[PDB]
Amino acid sequence: MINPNPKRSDEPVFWGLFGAGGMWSAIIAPVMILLVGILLPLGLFPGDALSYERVLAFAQSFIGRVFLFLMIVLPLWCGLHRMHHAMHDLKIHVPAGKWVFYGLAAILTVVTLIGVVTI
Amino acid sequence: TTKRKPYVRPMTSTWWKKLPFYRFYMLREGTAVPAVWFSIELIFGLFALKNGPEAWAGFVDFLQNPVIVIINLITLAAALLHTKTWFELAPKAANIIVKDEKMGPEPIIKSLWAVTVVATIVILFVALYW
Amino acid sequence: MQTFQADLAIVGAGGAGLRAAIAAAQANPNAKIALISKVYPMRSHTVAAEGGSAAVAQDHDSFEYHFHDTVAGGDWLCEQDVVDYFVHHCPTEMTQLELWGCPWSRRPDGSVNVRRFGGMKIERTWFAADKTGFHMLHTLFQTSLQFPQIQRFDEHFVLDILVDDGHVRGLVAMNMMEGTLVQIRANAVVMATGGAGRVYRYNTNGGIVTGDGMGMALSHGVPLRDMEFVQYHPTGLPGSGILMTEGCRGEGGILVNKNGYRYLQDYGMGPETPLGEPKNKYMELGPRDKVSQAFWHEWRKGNTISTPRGDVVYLDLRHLGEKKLHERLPFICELAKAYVGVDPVKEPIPVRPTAHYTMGGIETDQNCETRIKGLFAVGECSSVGLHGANRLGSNSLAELVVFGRLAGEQATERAATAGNGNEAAIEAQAAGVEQRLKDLVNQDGGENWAKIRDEMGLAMEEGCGIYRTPELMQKTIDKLAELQERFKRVRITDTSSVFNTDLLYTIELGHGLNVAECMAHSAMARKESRGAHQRLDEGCTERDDVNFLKHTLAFRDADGTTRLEYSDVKITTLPPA
Amino acid sequence: AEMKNLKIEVVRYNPEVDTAPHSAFYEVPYDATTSLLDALGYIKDNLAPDLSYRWSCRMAICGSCGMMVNNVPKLACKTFLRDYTDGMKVEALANFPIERDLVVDMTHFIESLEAIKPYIIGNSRTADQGTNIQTPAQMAKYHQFSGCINCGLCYAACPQFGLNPEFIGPAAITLAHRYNEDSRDHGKKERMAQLNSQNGVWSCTFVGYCSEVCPKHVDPAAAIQQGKVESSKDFLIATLKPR
Ligand SMILES: Cc1cc2nc3c(=O)[nH]c(=O)nc-3n(C[C@H](O)[C@H](O)[C@H](O)COP(=O)(O)OP(=O)(O)OC[C@H]3O[C@@H](n4cnc5c(N)ncnc54)[C@H](O)[C@@H]3O)c2cc1C
Ligand SMILES: O=C(O)CCCC(=O)O
Ligand code: SF4
Ligand code: F3S
Ligand code: FES
């Protein structure tokens, strides 16, 4: 019954990504949700550290661009990867799972790549 | 012919609802949602930031809508959970022998949080202090 | 009955059975071998062995020391021609086990470590933590997967063997899941069913060790050798009879009575040794029998601590400490915690001698062949003449691989030389089996099998103990005779066919009683004290080389009588004196 | 003295008569030391003599013991009644087809184990040359993973196995990993295919319940992870082989 010789899985690429994704997201997202999610919108910051001028100065620097890219993209691969598996475990039947989720990532990757090559 | 009728119990969509160990796993996986939600926010942010001061202001206004705040707080709760659980699991990928024993997960767990702490500070510093 | 062809059939998927399985496949690649087991191969009792397997490894050792050790520990009832061979193939076989992946505990220089067992002066016991059996069986089983030649029949209960004209020609087994009968044709058959420890009330054995193979052999004219010799292990948990490895006492554990007195010094095994350094042959490490005997005496004085589980003495392991314990005693640590509620670092563990190893078994030549051409026995169910009156600790597991192999190889040749038997009388033999079974199913009477069981176990304990007296051996013999009778009035209430255990347990009980009778009859007839056999009655308390340097052979005749014969003991270079 | 009794529910099933498994209750006397396997036996000898189950060692070493107890994959011979004073429901090992009573078809599990070639491969050394050399450090690599008693609890535990019966499962993977990590073996290539399949390591979403129930403390979850890493290493090598 157990087949003689199975076909290699594709998963090591997605797992590879989701690996970096989950790792980055784990170390860095906390701080980031704090700043953008709570500190900035509540004005709880020294002088003008999170003023529209300063953010932009950083966003337009080389480091900033690279940084924002990873920051947006890495957790996307991780999280989407996970939602894809959540479908199976939750017993939900999804047409073209890999194409939907991993597609969605690739798009937003691009949307982002564009975004940080500047709009 | 055979007298045996092997009975196969069916696995239901709700299986994880049964045992708390499973629920907690579902919860662990639930953190994916806010993860992407947040990454999405950053996109709006990023693009509104490129369309100049007026758009950026209306983005900062969005993040002030009392509901959004509540969602972003939850986002952070999700995040921390992801962090804590992630830190428990990654060490299992290593198979590391320190003088004749297989080293436990603890040494790595600590290092990972140590790095998290340094990072958390370094960013809060650079972001707010200069 | 569906029929299967095989070049040879192995009954039993334990260590020895599997070792024969592999041996046969390497000796002839084109063979169809039938490996037959009532449980999955890795459930065999062998897996529970903790002490270790014995083989000459150290530079200052010698095969002659191993030999001396066996024959002496066997009280000179060993076949010295067989012992000689055995010792010589121990390293080969142990090494090969390493070669197939057995993770033997190693010296820091990365070579196999060895420790002392069974009182051997030079330590030659190879070990893997204290799960040596577990590793050996799993290694052997997992190895056996790579031979296409081996066809497995898992969960198949072997009912009988087929024989005509002094030759084995096959066997008949139940497919336990389906409840249907099967017949495997083979011109040579290996009995590797393990012993009969399960006929005692308290014993260290797995439920499956019920003597089946021996019983089967009995039914065909084959005698059982030296069934009076039954080995108790000095230290077992009360109630379950669960074994605590001698390794406890090798690492420095102590045995104390209700006054915390180390009692063994008062029984010829003194002077008390310091907690640090134990010494071989002294105190807790004294000879096996003397340590068990000492329990009996201590109980006589009223020095045993009394639990609801029974009267016990204490095995004290606290002075060993945390680290020492977890490196070598982790398994023993969890057992005691689980089954008696004792952390061995916090407090003492209850122990008492328990029935352990069947020295006796199916009679065999130096080639593992029985009096029925093509029929073989190996391992605990057999008697090759290795152990004599007392098995050396760790020589048993060694025996599985050493003789397992020999059997697999010998059976390969008999299967090749066979020629054919008469298929009419053969198919009639099978009709016979099938019919005897329907006889047992239909049998009415309303006697409960489990009580005949419970009562056989009791008679065995009370009559065939560490110490043995005519009065009790007789009462046991008598008791067994009633139980044998009552057995014929048993009703198997469960009539279903899918994994009927009611039936299976009942059949094994049948076998138990036949075997039990052979221990009891053999023991009484041996009017002497030798090895595991200790009689208290006048003029039977010592070793008699004049009249009893001979093996006991117990046959069972169609009339249901257990009749004894004696045979000579082959001696080469080690005459007693 | 007087032994307290315990009302034990056991889910009976007879393929010949029953259409589905149905509960059955049995009063068992017990004390501090009574296991479920002891209880099971009492029932068989005294109350229900058609009660079929697997057991042998009586000391949690053979692995034939496995069943469900209050919805937890447990070993009869290691489950003690003293803990279940507040009701005790006993069921056949989950995620396996029930054959009869507490006895489940273990077949997939067997074939699974067999498929990963669990035996030393491609070591030409022979017995006359003596044994291989292997340091305690080298053993430590695979050692813990070598203690699986093929009990199968970890499969009843695994919801991924529950949702994909074709998933070779925690044990099988673990056992493969043990041989791959044995310094004495060179049959890694012969095992990767099975581990690399979607039904291989790639069916594990790291629920990690396997390691939680495993009576032999083998942490199969950790081997699956370690196997995920190796499958990915393996994937890369084979992507970069144009050869
Ligand atoms: C707790 C314990 C510890 C021990 N430790 C050591 C030790 O450290 N060193 C040492 O040398 N010895 C030790 N021994 C003794 C040794 O383990 C056994 O004698 C040895 O394992 C027997 O192996 P075997 O193959 O002959 O029997 P087993 O391995 O018990 O063979 C059993 C096989 O035969 C099959 N079988 C039986 N009846 C039937 C049937 N009717 N139909 C089909 N199949 C059947 C079973 O299904 C099973 O596959 C120990 C024994 C015990 C109980
Ligand atoms: O004490 C042990 O662990 C083994 C006793 C001797 C044997 O059975 O081989
Ligand atoms: S890993 Fe643990 S649970 Fe799984 S079969 Fe092996 S011993 Fe049993
Ligand atoms: S529970 Fe199952 S999902 Fe993986 S971690 Fe264990 S095999
Ligand atoms: S009976 Fe052997 S594992 Fe429970």
Side-chain angles (χ1 to χ4, degrees):
Chain A
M1 170 54 150
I2 286 10
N3 123 303
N5 176 199
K7 45 272 165 203
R8 192 152 206 160
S9 186
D10 247 335
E11 203 96 348
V13 247
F14 301 118
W15 188 77
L17 287 173
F18 151 75
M23 181 58 74
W24 180 283
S25 106
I27 279 118
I28 293 150
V31 185
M32 292 305 293
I33 307 172
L34 181 64
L35 294 156
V36 174
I38 314 165
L39 297 193
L40 169 105
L42 292 178
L44 306 158
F45 61 97
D48 261 16
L50 307 176
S51 32
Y52 149 71
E53 270 92 28
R54 203 168 164 281
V55 175
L56 193 60
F58 171 74
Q60 291 175 79
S61 72
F62 182 30
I63 219 174
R65 295 172 167 320
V66 162
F67 182 87
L68 249 19
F69 181 61
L70 296 174
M71 190 59 248
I72 298 176
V73 173
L74 295 183
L76 274 183
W77 291 101
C78 177
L80 286 167
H81 183 126
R82 278 179 133 161
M83 289 173 184
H84 170 50
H85 277 63
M87 282 0 250
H88 193 293
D89 304 345
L90 269 173
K91 298 218 76 192
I92 243 154
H93 298 205
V94 182
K98 283 179 134 183
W99 297 98
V100 174
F101 294 96
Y102 299 116
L104 197 60
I107 287 159
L108 301 172
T109 307
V110 180
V111 164
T112 299
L113 179 55
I114 288 165
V116 302
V117 185
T118 256
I119 197 189
Chain B
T1 98
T2 167
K3 265 146 269 181
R4 54 203 206 87
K5 206 168 53 61
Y7 177 73
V8 194
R9 301 162 270 192
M11 205 175 195
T12 269
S13 59
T14 76
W15 61 268
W16 53 268
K17 275 190 180 184
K18 311 273 157 56
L19 154 68
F21 195 97
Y22 293 148
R23 307 177 104 266
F24 183 93
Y25 159 84
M26 275 325 214
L27 186 59
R28 192 231 283 155
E29 302 298 282
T31 59
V33 172
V36 320
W37 157 245
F38 182 78
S39 263
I40 298 293
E41 282 182 340
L42 288 198
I43 304 160
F44 289 13
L46 175 67
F47 275 135
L49 176 66
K50 256 266 74 190
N51 290 341
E54 203 204 281
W56 178 258
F59 167 66
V60 174
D61 200 41
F62 186 80
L63 309 177
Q64 285 170 29
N65 285 326
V67 193
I68 301 307
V69 190
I70 288 155
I71 290 172
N72 282 168
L73 291 183
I74 296 162
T75 308
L76 188 59
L80 303 184
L81 179 64
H82 164 76
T83 301
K84 183 208 160 199
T85 52
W86 191 261
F87 282 169
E88 283 152 349
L89 307 193
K92 295 303 180 195
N95 187 278
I96 306 182
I97 313 299
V98 66
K99 319 142 43 206
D100 290 3
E101 286 228 63
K102 193 171 89 179
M103 169 201 71
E106 323 268 51
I108 296 183
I109 313 270
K110 309 279 91 169
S111 285
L112 289 174
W113 276 107
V115 180
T116 284
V117 154
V118 181
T120 303
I121 287 154
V122 176
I123 293 152
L124 284 175
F125 179 60
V126 172
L128 306 179
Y129 271 22
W130 282 47
Chain C
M1 259 196 278
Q2 184 58 21
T3 291
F4 284 71
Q5 298 289 286
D7 300 85
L8 81 171
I10 302 156
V11 177
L18 279 163
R19 187 59 257 252
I22 297 144
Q26 286 178 318
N28 165 33
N30 296 323
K32 204 304 186 97
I33 308 157
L35 193 55
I36 311 145
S37 178
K38 61 178 183 186
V39 295
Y40 286 107
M42 75 295 266
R43 275 80 209 265
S44 319
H45 181 54
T46 289
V47 74
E50 25 214 43
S53 206
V56 171
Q58 269 180 108
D59 284 322
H60 56 104
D61 214 340
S62 154
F63 290 111
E64 163 71 27
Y65 300 126
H66 201 188
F67 179 95
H68 197 70
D69 271 4
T70 298
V71 171
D75 248 348
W76 275 262
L77 274 192
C78 306
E79 300 302 284
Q80 286 186 8
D81 57 346
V82 176
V83 180
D84 183 79
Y85 174 91
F86 159 77
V87 303
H88 279 296
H89 300 64
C90 281
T92 323
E93 280 332 333
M94 248 45 71
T95 287
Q96 174 71 248
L97 258 186
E98 194 279 346
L99 284 203
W100 288 331
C102 202
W104 295 114
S105 319
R106 314 270 193 149
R107 288 190 187 100
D109 66 335
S111 62
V112 290
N113 211 357
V114 301
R115 49 184 184 174
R116 165 173 309 108
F117 267 93
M120 310 179 201
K121 169 144 83 183
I122 314 304
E123 54 283 81
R124 65 195 59 131
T125 294
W126 299 43
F127 68 110
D130 49 1
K131 297 156 100 80
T132 304
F134 161 82
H135 285 114
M136 286 178 85
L137 183 58
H138 274 70
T139 301
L140 285 163
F141 172 55
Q142 286 158 174
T143 299
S144 83
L145 299 169
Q146 78 177 304
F147 300 95
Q149 303 85 339
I150 303 151
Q151 196 48 97
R152 267 198 284 112
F153 294 74
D154 310 323
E155 317 218 283
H156 278 57
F157 205 100
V158 173
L159 299 169
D160 205 357
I161 51 163
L162 314 164
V163 182
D164 195 16
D165 208 351
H167 210 289
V168 64
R169 291 296 171 183
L171 64 92
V172 174
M174 187 170 274
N175 179 133
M176 290 161 75
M177 193 83 282
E178 304 269 357
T180 59
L181 300 173
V182 166
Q183 148 190 167
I184 294 161
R185 291 308 176 82
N187 288 326
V189 166
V190 183
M191 284 291 116
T193 61
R198 278 260 102 179
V199 316
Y200 281 70
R201 212 288 178 92
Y202 303 117
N203 63 77
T204 70
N205 297 212
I208 52 174
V209 148
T210 55
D212 310 342
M214 290 178 192
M216 294 187 38
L218 257 195
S219 277
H220 289 257
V222 173
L224 300 181
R225 188 148 71 177
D226 301 357
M227 299 305 294
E228 63 266 57
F229 305 103
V230 168
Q231 175 166 280
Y232 284 65
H233 187 108
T235 48
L237 300 188
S240 69
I242 277 165
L243 192 69
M244 310 275 89
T245 182
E246 167 196 287
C248 289
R249 297 171 289 122
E251 308 293 288
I254 52 160
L255 278 161
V256 296
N257 60 28
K258 74 168 179 169
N259 316 308
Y261 183 51
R262 287 172 81 192
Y263 46 79
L264 295 168
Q265 55 188 306
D266 278 5
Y267 293 94
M269 285 161 292
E272 201 187 324
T273 46
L275 279 186
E277 352 92 355
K279 219 200 186 100
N280 183 232
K281 271 152 172 272
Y282 297 107
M283 229 50 50
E284 285 73 10
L285 296 194
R288 220 200 311 268
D289 295 347
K290 297 273 163 183
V291 178
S292 312
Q293 289 170 260
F295 180 96
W296 192 91
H297 297 312
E298 279 295 292
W299 166 82
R300 179 227 168 203
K301 284 173 188 175
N303 294 340
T304 41
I305 307 86
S306 302
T307 76
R309 317 226 60 179
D311 270 43
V312 290
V313 307
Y314 282 131
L315 176 53
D316 194 46
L317 307 192
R318 318 198 236 84
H319 61 274
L320 303 171
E322 269 320 70
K323 176 69 187 165
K324 194 163 187 195
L325 280 155
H326 290 24
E327 200 176 44
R328 310 105 131 127
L329 309 173
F331 191 30
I332 291 311
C333 281
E334 182 69 85
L335 286 168
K337 277 199 95 166
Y339 298 96
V340 296
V342 172
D343 195 310
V345 206
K346 196 184 73 194
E347 77 170 1
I349 68 172
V351 282
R352 77 165 164 191
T354 59
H356 189 56
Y357 183 80
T358 305
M359 259 89 80
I362 311 162
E363 193 203 34
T364 41
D365 64 3
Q366 307 77 39
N367 291 335
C368 292
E369 209 175 6
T370 69
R371 296 179 182 207
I372 303 174
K373 216 142 157 156
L375 171 83
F376 298 83
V378 73
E380 198 178 329
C381 80
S382 81
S383 163
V384 280
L386 180 52
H387 309 310
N390 245 329
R391 178 200 60 117
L392 227 55
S394 77
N395 272 359
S396 160
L397 286 169
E399 199 219 333
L400 312 179
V401 295
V402 169
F403 289 101
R405 175 186 197 153
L406 189 60
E409 275 169 358
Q410 286 306 79
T412 314
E413 293 179 341
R414 295 328 198 112
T417 308
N420 299 317
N422 164 227
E423 222 240 303
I426 293 166
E427 186 74 52
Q429 280 271 303
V433 177
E434 193 160 313
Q435 184 58 211
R436 276 179 274 162
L437 182 71
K438 289 199 170 76
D439 278 22
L440 185 76
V441 161
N442 294 355
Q443 164 180 330
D444 262 305
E447 204 81 45
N448 184 29
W449 86 273
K451 302 302 166 179
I452 298 171
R453 188 196 68 211
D454 284 338
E455 285 189 66
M456 167 181 60
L458 275 178
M460 275 327 232
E461 281 293 341
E462 202 217 12
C464 304
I466 312 148
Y467 283 121
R468 307 183 186 178
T469 66
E471 198 206 278
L472 291 158
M473 283 189 279
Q474 196 74 54
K475 162 177 170 183
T476 305
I477 283 159
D478 293 320
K479 191 48 159 175
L480 286 179
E482 324 158 10
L483 293 159
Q484 275 285 24
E485 166 64 347
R486 287 219 254 121
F487 182 85
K488 274 178 269 197
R489 291 189 307 184
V490 145
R491 202 213 161 149
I492 302 177
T493 42
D494 182 2
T495 64
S496 59
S497 318
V498 189
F499 219 84
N500 205 300
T501 42
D502 202 40
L503 167 56
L504 297 181
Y505 293 14
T506 281
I507 289 148
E508 299 163 322
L509 176 55
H511 293 303
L513 292 154
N514 304 4
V515 178
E517 282 192 299
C518 289
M519 307 185 190
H521 273 300
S522 287
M524 182 88 208
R526 190 169 292 263
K527 309 215 173 166
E528 72 146 356
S529 269
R530 190 185 222 95
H533 192 53
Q534 300 300 300
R535 293 184 54 138
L536 300 175
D537 60 310
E538 198 189 4
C540 290
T541 60
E542 297 155 13
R543 218 184 82 186
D544 179 352
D545 285 24
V546 175
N547 290 300
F548 283 100
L549 204 68
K550 41 206 211 170
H551 298 285
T552 314
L553 300 176
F555 298 74
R556 183 170 178 89
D557 285 283
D559 31 73
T561 54
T562 314
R563 298 181 176 265
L564 296 179
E565 297 195 336
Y566 296 103
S567 71
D568 280 333
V569 184
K570 173 79 194 162
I571 291 176
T572 61
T573 84
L574 193 57
Chain D
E2 197 39 67
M3 297 184 90
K4 304 155 287 182
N5 287 38
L6 181 67
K7 194 170 176 179
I8 291 170
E9 186 176 36
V10 166
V11 181
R12 307 287 317 248
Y13 175 68
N14 183 347
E16 304 199 74
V17 176
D18 293 321
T19 139
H22 67 95
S23 278
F25 308 82
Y26 303 97
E27 294 296 326
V28 195
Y30 81 97
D31 57 37
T33 68
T34 323
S35 68
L36 171 66
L37 177 55
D38 282 326
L40 287 186
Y42 176 90
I43 314 309
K44 211 197 171 56
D45 304 330
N46 296 21
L47 315 171
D50 65 325
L51 185 64
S52 297
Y53 51 88
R54 279 162 183 150
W55 63 286
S56 176
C57 80
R58 309 181 287 115
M59 47 186 271
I61 189 63
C62 67
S64 52
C65 227
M67 64 202 54
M68 301 303 285
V69 182
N70 279 358
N71 254 19
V72 175
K74 274 212 140 65
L75 292 179
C77 67
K78 213 185 182 189
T79 324
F80 296 91
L81 303 193
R82 65 179 165 273
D83 303 306
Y84 298 82
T85 57
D86 294 7
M88 187 175 200
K89 198 191 208 208
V90 184
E91 264 172 295
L93 210 53
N95 303 310
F96 290 116
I98 313 167
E99 291 282 3
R100 153 84 176 283
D101 283 318
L102 306 176
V103 167
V104 294
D105 179 352
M106 287 280 284
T107 313
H108 177 88
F109 183 97
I110 311 295
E111 311 180 300
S112 290
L113 265 60
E114 298 189 78
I116 44 98
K117 315 271 193 74
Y119 44 93
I120 290 304
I121 290 170
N123 188 317
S124 63
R125 196 174 185 98
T126 56
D128 25 298
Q129 318 185 323
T131 72
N132 293 292
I133 299 312
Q134 188 181 252
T135 70
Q138 280 177 297
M139 269 182 67
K141 211 89 187 183
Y142 70 75
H143 201 227
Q144 173 191 21
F145 302 130
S146 69
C148 177
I149 64 175
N150 313 358
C151 68
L153 294 202
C154 51
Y155 282 65
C158 194
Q160 287 326 322
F161 179 71
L163 293 161
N164 177 25
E166 287 309 354
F167 169 44
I168 72 196
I173 293 167
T174 297
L175 197 68
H177 190 61
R178 171 263 176 276
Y179 279 96
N180 284 338
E181 297 288 349
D182 196 321
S183 76
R184 286 169 297 166
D185 164 73
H186 329 116
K188 202 162 158 163
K189 32 165 180 172
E190 324 292 329
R191 298 178 195 102
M192 291 318 305
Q194 279 296 346
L195 290 184
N196 297 342
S197 89
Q198 190 57 64
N199 293 320
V201 304
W202 299 117
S203 291
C204 192
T205 73
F206 208 140
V207 186
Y209 196 41
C210 23
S211 304
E212 256 287 20
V213 302
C214 184
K216 285 289 136 166
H217 286 127
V218 183
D219 194 12
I224 302 184
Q225 194 70 161
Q226 289 170 43
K228 260 164 202 151
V229 182
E230 223 54 43
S231 190
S232 305
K233 280 222 205 87
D234 195 46
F235 185 102
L236 210 75
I237 305 160
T239 286
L240 315 169
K241 106 287 178 88
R243 302 306 305 167

